[PDB]
Amino acid sequence: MSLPKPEDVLVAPNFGIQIDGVMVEYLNSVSNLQIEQDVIRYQQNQGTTGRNNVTLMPGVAKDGSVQVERGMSQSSVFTQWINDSMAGRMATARKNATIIVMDYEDNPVKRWNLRNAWCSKVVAGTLKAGDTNALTETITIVFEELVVE
């Protein structure tokens, strides 16, 4: 990043996690939303129009981020995470999504996911004879209460 001209590229998205999500394919659905509000009023006892107040500022939204593990293997890392929550333990954890530069030693952007994050879904891919380009991917859905840069 010697010039203002480059932008971060999909070089090496990776994750800080205590659960061994060691190798991944991709990360998606990541966003930051502040909810707005809208009120319309009539003006102060005179011949002018009403006003629109859109400078009102309600709280911050929460969501979840899709995580795709390349595929099934013999190591049931995500399966146990979901089992602990189904069993009733508040088995949540902090996570860190990292964006990395062309020269990988440079790691400028990180997003902190709240300690209350947890897994609600595990989804299997389709298994069909002869598909060839279908390679048993797994989709993990994690709820993120709060995301901070």
């Binding site: 003006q43 102060q44 005179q46 011949g47 002018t48 129009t49 006003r51």
Partner: protein
């Protein structure tokens, strides 16, 4: 044709508390030195003055406005007191500079900003005790006014002598103490009040309380209309009840009146300036324009930045238009549309090709006057 392109238009000399702020210059006992001019409320004023016990008018004028509207004032100690020459006009409550020590009197002006009104509670009082009569007082009033005129945004409030006939004020104002300018106001009558340190009565000037009249008006409704019907909340009575012939006598000469009404109380009634210029006869207009100037100047930080860039002209038009249209959509302008009520222009013809540092030329129509 007041300034708009710059606080300084020949030389690039150019490189909170609230608007209801006034400064008072006068004497006090056991008070902080004149150098540390303070911005205070009443509790603080008393800590810096005492409970009216020095017998000086600052306590009454500060207590006067403070009990009306307003949030703060600048206290000028100037000088001290005798037990139970500080009173002389030059050595303190006058045109003091101190080789820019700006420690005393009117020397604090220019050095100190965020003041819209100034007054001198005690000078119009040393006329007897120290025999400070005639030009000795006129000289101080001329100074207070001159400083306001030099700064460009300040209004001086001054007093007439304490005991006189309506004919006498007319002569005093027309023959011995006329001022003729856009920076000052005077009300004829003196007010009956009191001083709890000694007793239930005391003669005081139409000063201090008046600062609190504009402060309430401007902070609760705005500077759209003059506070010409407001109640002098702390008045006990008036020295003289002005009659119709007296009101007719003062009106055309620019003297404002305070009068008592039968179930309406003691109110300020006149609304004119001490000036012969028709354009600036009313206080409401003079205040309206100073208000707009404070907002426009604080809004522009673009003092030293590519003095040749034209894109700046576009940025200027943008900010100015947004501010004035917002005022149009409220009660500021007398018209049906900004097209017939407000004007702004900033282009190559207003900022000549030479590209002198004296750029930032913006032509504006306030409501009709050109600025």
């Amino acid at each position: 044709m007041p300034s708009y392109l710059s606080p300084g238009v020949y030389v690039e000399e150019v490189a909170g508390v609230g608007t209801s702020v006034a400064a008072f210059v006068g004497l006090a006992p056991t008070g902080p030195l004149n150098e540390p001019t303070l911005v205070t409320n009443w509790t603080q004023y008393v800590a810096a003055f005492g409970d009216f016990t020095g017998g000086y008018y600052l306590a009454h004028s500060v207590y006067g406005f403070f009990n009306n509207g307003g949030s703060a004032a600048y206290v000028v100690r100037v000088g001290g007191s005798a037990e139970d020459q500080a009173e002389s006009a030059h050595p303190g409550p006058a045109q003091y500079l101190g080789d820019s020590s700006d420690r005393t009197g009117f020397g604090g002006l220019e050095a100190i900003d965020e003041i819209s009104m100034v007054a001198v509670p005690d000078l119009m009082a040393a006329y007897q005790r120290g025999a400070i009569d005639l030009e000795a007082v006129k000289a101080v009033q001329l100074g207070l006014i001159a400083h306001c005129e030099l700064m460009g945004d300040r209004v001086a409030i001054i007093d007439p002598p304490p005991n006189q006939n309506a004919r006498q004020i007319r002569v005093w104002r027309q023959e011995t103490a006329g001022y003729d300018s856009k920076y000052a106001a005077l009300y004829y009558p003196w007010i009956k009040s009191f001083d709890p340190a000694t007793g239930q009565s005391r003669l005081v000037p139409p000063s201090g309380h008046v600062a609190g009249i504009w402060a309430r008006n401007d902070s609760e409704r705005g500077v759209h209309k003059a506070p010409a019907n407001e109640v002098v909340r702390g008045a006990v009575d008036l020295e003289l009840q002005i009659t119709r012939g007296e009101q007719d006598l003062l009106n055309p000469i620019g003297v404002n009146c305070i009068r008592s009404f039968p179930g309406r109380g003691i109110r300020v009634w006149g609304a004119r300036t001490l000036s012969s210029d028709p354009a600036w006869r009313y206080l409401n207009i003079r205040r309206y324009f100073n208000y707009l100037e404070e907002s426009i100047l604080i809004g522009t930080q673009w003092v030293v930045f590519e003095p040749n860039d034209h894109n700046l002209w576009a940025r200027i038009r943008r900010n100015v238009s947004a501010f004035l249209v917002n005022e149009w959509r409220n009660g500021a302008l007398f018209g049906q549309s900004p097209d017939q009520a407000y004007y702004v222009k900033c282009d190559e013809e207003t900022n000549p090709p030479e590209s002198v540092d004296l750029g930032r030329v913006v032509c504006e129509i306030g409501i009709a006057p050109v600025k």
